[PDB]
Amino acid sequence: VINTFDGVADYLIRYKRLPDNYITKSQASALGWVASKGNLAEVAPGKSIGGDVFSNREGRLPSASGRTWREADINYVSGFRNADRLVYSSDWLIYKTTDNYATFTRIR
């Protein structure tokens, strides 16, 4: 499984999509994930949530004409989701957050 900031950031750059262990929130919910029960590893073993559109409503990441962002959970193993995420743009800027979106750090 590829679920680290660097492992994912490089797979993204090379492949232009997430590695195989990721599923959207709609996919996860289709398999039986309920956020409040923290059951993702049980209904989707070895899977992490990622690929959903990230709105950037607070404007914490740089906004550019035609640029959209996506997000992915990093370091997830099981139970409730952690606070680590990879946020990536259509133009391939890649930021990481370790505090559940409070702050970002460019990494690519």
Swiss-Prot record:
UniProt-listed Enzyme Commission number(s): 3.1.27.-
Principal location class: secreted
Keyword Nucleus: no
Cellular component GO terms, alphabetical: extracellular region
Subcellular location: Secreted
GO MF annotation, one: RNA binding
Positions of the catalytic residues: 71 (proton acceptor), 100 (proton donor)
Keyword presence, Chloroplast: no
Family statement drawn from the similarity comment of this UniProt entry: Belongs to the ribonuclease N1/T1 family.
Protein purpose: This is a purine-specific ribonuclease.
Protein name as it appears in the record: Ribonuclease
Natural source organism: Bacillus intermedius
